[PDB]
RNA sequence: AAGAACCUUACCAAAUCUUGACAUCCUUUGACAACUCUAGAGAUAGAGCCUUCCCCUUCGGGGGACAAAGUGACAGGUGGUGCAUGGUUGUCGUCAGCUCGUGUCGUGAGAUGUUGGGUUAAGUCCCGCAACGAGCGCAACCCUUAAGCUUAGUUGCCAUCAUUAAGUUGGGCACUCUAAGUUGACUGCCGGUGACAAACCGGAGGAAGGUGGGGAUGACGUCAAAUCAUCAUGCCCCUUAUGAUUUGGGCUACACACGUGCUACAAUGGACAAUACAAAGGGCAGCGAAACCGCGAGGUCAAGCAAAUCCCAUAAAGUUGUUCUCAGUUCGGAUUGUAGUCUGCAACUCGACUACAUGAAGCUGGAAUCGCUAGUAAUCGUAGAUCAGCAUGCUACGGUGAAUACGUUC
């Protein structure tokens, strides 16, 4: 959703990729109201690749995180990173009953 | 508003003093943002610096909710996806 | 730009009001008193340097 | 009927220990002198930020003290008058003279 | 927070102002003329390693004293500077000043002198941990019970900056009756802007 | 952590309709709140001439359970409700299921309400019901 | 006669009172309170030093009030009386003091502050 | 950004320019120009015209300062790098912890102290404890407020007086109130309890009794947090320009979403008419007083004033009677256009405000979710900055005045 990049100009290949590959994680659960992601360049002088995202929750939010050379594999970062997240947040939780008196 | 009454730029007026007495000139750049309608400037016709450039315009009658501080609407298509 | 909006101030004007007061020793134009003609963080920068009462603080 | 005067310091007993040598002077060759009558002692404030840039909540306050200080003596001499413009210091009143 | 010099609080309680002048809403010229005094003592500054000074002001006209620590250099001799300066001030000042020098001892002792002391001397490509650690040893020396000496910028000349504090004794900050002294300086080698921190306690 | 004493009501030197007025008194004007409160009194000491203290305390008594339940997953409990508590209760139930009534004037349902529960009738002493419903229906699973 | 005097102060709301003993009756500042404080009619309450304290009465009444409106106007009203009462004798400190009287709750409206806004609330969040 | 028409505004346009818009160094040297004319969009120039060595000159110089020019450095860069930085700030969080010196034990990194019990707002305090002492930090410590005594009585007050429409006149400083120094609240004192001690509950007094109210204050470090666009500055780059003056646009456009907040969805209500209570600040050609004009905006002159004096000013909610009698309503006033006031030369894109009419959804909001432990929440107004003009914002002031706190399950 939010996206503010800063030292380019974003493009659209990357926007159907991106929020595609993200919207394949229904499985659990999606809920997408909000997705704010973050970026910039900076010089090292190998100069950067910065790849940083929210991806907020149900009463709670998050942070993934990532610096690469490249953002097809920085990226596949963005998102198996949140996966094991959401997935997790789901297990929990607690049921195992058991009568009481 | 204005406080009785109405006023203009008066380096326009030295203008059109100048080209009204003869078969009247119908060609003008020029700047026309403190100056508003009196019918000494017609005979003349209108092109105003629109914030860009000058645009002209054929003077006409019903010339009554309006003056020549702008008649080109400068956002400039539109700036908008929609028409009007 | 700055260097010559500096100029631009104090030099004359064609009447009134097209004339702006920003502070002296930073350029900072908005946000700024008419009393002292100084900015919102000039008063602070010079504020502990204590020469003027000028409290500091905290009783209203 | 007297002197009056008006002092104002931004050190609160300058006011008083002047105040009170000065009405020595006042009281050496007279006397009919009317004390320290306290005004109220108005302020002001600058609400400035505790910021370069944003953060705008995260503020703070300096603000100042205007005091007044209101005193007199009546049956004049010319002495008394030098009472007055005799001393002065510490000069950080507004002093002003009047009747 | 974060933190913040305590002689913004510990003044208009229990310290001096660093000017006066008496009352009224001409402040601006007042004012601003006396900061180019202020800015026109770096003739001094730059030749006397002084400390400061806080003015006051007469009816029609003005009393100074600047709280110096080489009082014969800022003397001149015979007082061959005193009344050319005298002039030159009231000359840039465009008003009548009245010079009274006031020297400053135990020696070199408060935030002024000591900190653009050390940046000075660190500025000469001086093993700067060994300087302070001199200061130090000469600050414990003169009598005062906690000193606390940091600076910062890219130090040796060389990649990002980080900043390195040698603290000592009892100096507290959150009490409110101090009567002590901080600074901070400027001066630069090679890499930007290379700033210390001085601390002290007296009674 | 204690409660907020009336001192009395210095109408019928009551307490009770104090505490009833400050849940009646809208942005604190008492002045409006005891208006329409004093309304209430003529009005209601008209039809079926009688007291208030009679309607009041009759009907705040019929509408006013003895249990209520609560949840602790979410265990709903039956437990002998405690007395002020039990009050604002009666109080709040009563204003509460008052002005839905579609009524336009200030008074008439609210008259309308207390001389309802006065004859054990009212969707308060309703609630009153189904609260000791839940409750001895609430006694098998958390009892 | 003898006039006792207590003197009170709540909510910018000094209670110069003039009690006098006699019949009890009210002049808020040259007219009585009845019609003035709005609406009202709470004034047996502020009877209060007689309800309770040399029950019932009375003595009279002068009273030199201004500032703040009716409330703390109307409990200076209190304070005055019974501290000017605990001057005509103390005799009674054990049922006016069991009801306090002389307790000046100093509550008040404390200072504005970052946030506060047209009513005091903080403010509501960013939110998803 | 505490006030985007111009300005600010840099972005866009063009008229122009280049030791320049702007400064320092070297010179001819000169006091630097007022007002007009020509054209111009202004910049400006042609200019006229009058700027015209003023401090001290013994004849010359010196010298504030020049007229533009010459002079080569130069100047400048909203041009970038908050990751090259300093400085400053939010942050967990006002969370209470974080450290050392000495001595020990450990092969060794390290631990010890900082742990055990109890207790506290908390490394608070105490008992014990190869440990002992300090450093930071908590509290006090500074402010402001409730109770108080004393000093000083106006422009403040009348308790005794007559006097005035009137605290106005004469009188008084008694009293509120007034700004400076004074105690009082420190578990201080009593009872119980407790490892007696630390310490908990209650009592007494007291105005305040449990770190009195609130603020000031943010330990070590985390966020390569924000900042070169506060300011300065390391490196790079421009320099007939990324630098500059000048006029005009525009930073405010809206198929869209979001966030933010302000306002109605009404009979406790709406509208009418009479009436009372606040605090706090500002004020010189600035606060504008009556009287006058008008539907109002506003304007006529000017009373008074560097202020506990004169003005902003009048308070609002409330209350008082009337009526409205549940509507898309006497709710709603968005909207659109008609007509006036004030501002600055200047209200088109783009200032509000004044009477006319028009009178939309909206009849309390789904899922969702946020603040708050009492003068709170909730609610009515006042004034200060910014200010030619401009606040549903912010700031400060007040006036009115609730439910809930079982228990820490979760």
């Known amino acids: ?101 | 508003s204005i406080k009785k009454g109405p006023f203009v730029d008066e380096h326009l007026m030295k203008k059109v003093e100048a080209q009204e007495g003869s078969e009247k000139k119908q060609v003008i750049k020029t700047w026309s943002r403190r100056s508003t309608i009196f019918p000494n400037f017609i005979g003349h016709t209108f092109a105003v610096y629109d914030g860009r450039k000058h645009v002209p315009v054929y003077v006409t009658e019903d010339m009554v909710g309006h003056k020549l501080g702008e008649f080109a609407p400068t956002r400039t298509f539109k700036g908008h996806v929609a028409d009007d | 730009a700055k260097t010559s909006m500096v100029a631009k101030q104090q030099k004359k004007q064609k009447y009134a009001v097209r004339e702006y007061t920003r502070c002296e020793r930073c350029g900072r134009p908005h946000s700024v008193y008419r009393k002292f003609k100084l900015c919102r963080i000039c008063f602070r920068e010079l504020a502990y340097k204590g020469q003027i009462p000028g409290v500091r603080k905290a009783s209203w | 009927q007297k002197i009056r005067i008006r002092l104002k310091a931004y050190d609160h007993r300058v006011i008083d220990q002047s105040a009170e040598k000065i009405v020595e002077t006042a009281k050496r060759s007279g006397a009919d002198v009317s004390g320290p009558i306290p005004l109220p002692t108005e302020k002001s404030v600058y609400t400035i930020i505790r910021a370069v840039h944003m953060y705008k909540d995260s503020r703070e306050q300096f603000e100042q003290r205007t005091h007044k200080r209101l005193i007199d003596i009546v049956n004049p001499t010319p002495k008394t008058v030098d009472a007055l413009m005799g001393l002065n210091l510490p000069s950080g009143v507004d002093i002003e003279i009047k009747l | 927070g974060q933190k913040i010099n305590p002689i913004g609080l510990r003044v208009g309680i229990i310290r001096d102002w660093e000017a006066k002048w008496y009352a009224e809403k001409d402040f601006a010229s007042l004012l601003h003329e006396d900061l180019k005094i202020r800015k026109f003592i770096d003739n001094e500054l730059k030749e006397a390693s002084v400390s400061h000074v806080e003015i006051e002001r007469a009816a029609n006209r003005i009393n100074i004293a600047i709280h110096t620590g080489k009082p014969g250099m800022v003397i001149g001799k015979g007082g061959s500077e005193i009344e050319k300066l005298r002039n030159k001030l009231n000359a840039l000042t465009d008003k009548k000043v009245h010079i009274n020098v006031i020297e400053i001892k135990k020696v070199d002792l408060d935030a002024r002198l000591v900190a653009e002391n050390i940046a000075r001397q660190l500025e000469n490509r001086a093993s700067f941990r060994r300087v302070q650690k001199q200061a130090i040893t000469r600050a414990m020396k003169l009598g005062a019970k906690g000193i606390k000496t940091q600076v910062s910028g890219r130090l040796g000349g060389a990649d990002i900056a980080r900043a390195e504090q040698y603290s000592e004794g009892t100096v507290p900050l959150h009490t409110l009756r101090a009567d002590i002294d901080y600074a901070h300086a400027e001066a630069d080698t090679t890499y930007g802007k290379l700033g210390v921190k001085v601390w002290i306690y007296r009674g | 952590v204690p409660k907020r004493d009336v001192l009395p009501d210095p109408i019928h030197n009551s307490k009770l309709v104090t505490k009833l007025i400050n849940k009646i008194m809208l942005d604190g004007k008492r002045g409006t709140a005891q208006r329409i409160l004093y309304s209430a009194f003529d009005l209601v000491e008209q039809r079926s001439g009688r007291d208030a203290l009679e309607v009041f305390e009759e009907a705040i008594n019929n509408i006013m359970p003895v249990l209520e339940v609560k949840a602790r997953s979410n265990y709903q409990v039956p437990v002998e409700v405690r007395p002020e508590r039990r009050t604002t209760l009666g109080l709040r139930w009563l204003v509460n299921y008052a002005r839905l009534r579609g009524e336009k004037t200030m008074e008439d349902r609210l008259a309308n309400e207390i001389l309802d529960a006065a004859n054990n009738t009212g969707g308060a002493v309703k609630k009153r019901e189904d609260t000791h419903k839940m409750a001895e229906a609430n006694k098998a699973f958390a009892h | 006669q003898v006039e006792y005097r207590g003197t009170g102060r709540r909510k910018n709301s000094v209670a110069r009172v003039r009690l006098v003993p006699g019949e009890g009756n009210i002049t808020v500042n040259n007219r009585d309170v009845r019609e003035y404080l709005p609406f009202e009619s709470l004034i047996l309450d502020l009877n209060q030093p007689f309800d309770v304290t040399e029950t019932k009465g009375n003595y009279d009444v002068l009273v030199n009030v201004h500032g703040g409106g009716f409330t703390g106007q109307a409990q200076a009203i209190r304070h005055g009386i019974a501290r000017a009462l605990l001057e005509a004798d103390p005799e009674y400190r054990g049922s006016l003091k069991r009801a306090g009287l002389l307790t000046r709750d100093p509550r008040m409206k404390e200072r504005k502050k970052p946030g506060l806004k047209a009513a005091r609330r903080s403010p509501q969040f960013s939110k998803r």
Do not use: C, M, W
């Open chain 1, 1 to 101: 959703f939010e996206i503010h990049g800063d030292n380019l100009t974003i493009t659209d290949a990357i926007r159907n990729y991106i929020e595609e590959k993200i919207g394949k994680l229904e499985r659990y659960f999606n809920d997408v109201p909000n997705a704010v992601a973050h970026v910039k360049v900076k010089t090292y002088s190998n100069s950067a690749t910065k790849i940083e995202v929210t991806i907020p929750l149900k009463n709670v939010t998050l942070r993934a995180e990532e610096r690469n050379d490249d953002l097809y594999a920085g990226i596949d970062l963005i998102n198996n990173k949140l996966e094991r997240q959401v997935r997790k947040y789901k297990t929990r939780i607690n049921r195992k009953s058991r009568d009481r008196g």
